[PDB]
Amino acid sequence: VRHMFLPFYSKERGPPRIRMQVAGVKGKRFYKIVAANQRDPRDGKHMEVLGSYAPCTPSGVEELRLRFSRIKFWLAAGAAFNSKMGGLLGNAGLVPLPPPMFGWRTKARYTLLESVMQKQEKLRENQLREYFKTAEPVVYRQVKKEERIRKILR
């Protein structure tokens, strides 16, 4: 350990780590991304607040707030982290992307599924263009009798 980061290492508690403290209230839970020592209480002692992570949000998209310079600084200092934090940092671009659970080599069925899904998306785009050529907001289609159908394009 370089002399600068010695205070970040605790004889009683362990080395520094980048981890998440539970936050919020019963039911509504998010996480505070902090730098702490290994044996500190999860929601207790820590050294710095590096960001927050909310998987469930009203916008429907997981939200990740991070101090990029501070994450770089703590990685340089040598803070350790687990698989989930490594994956979040890889998605954020702060660190290279860690391998998936069983490794990259083991994913071929999933690549085939991705290719099939892309092909179906292109087919639906072509169908949507064909629809655009007419663009009838309301249509009538048979059951006995004809019922009204609204062609909403969400």
């Binding site: 919020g24 509504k28 839970r29 998010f30 909310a54 998987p55 469930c56 949000t57 009203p58």
Partner: protein
């Protein structure tokens, strides 16, 4: 096509997929940094008069400000609203974003 004759069918259609009771399920509410705790709202007649947001600008600088190109820039009133910024203030805000630093 699905017919919701009663509210039970509507609930069944609208229900989200089941999730484990160990993960965060409810979204964290939005907190606006100006009404964190109360949400004033009106409770006294007139109930629907027009309310305009005003944010004071005051005097960001008290020293002589030279004209930008030809516009005076120097302030002339204390009543300027920061949510309805004038032409010259927007010009200053644009010049600052273009300063070389």
């Amino acid at each position: 096509s699905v017919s919701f004759k009663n509210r039970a069918e509507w609930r069944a259609f609208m229900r989200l997929p089941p999730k484990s009771r160990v993960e965060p399920r409810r979204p964290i509410p939005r907190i606006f940094p100006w009404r964190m705790a109360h949400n004033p709202l009106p409770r006294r007649y007139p109930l629907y008069k027009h309310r305009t947001l005003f944010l004071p600008l005051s005097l960001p600088s008290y020293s002589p400000q030279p004209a930008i190109s030809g516009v005076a820039v120097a302030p002339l009133t204390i009543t300027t609203n920061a949510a309805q910024l004038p032409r010259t203030a927007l010009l200053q805000s644009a010049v600052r974003q273009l300063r070389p630093l």
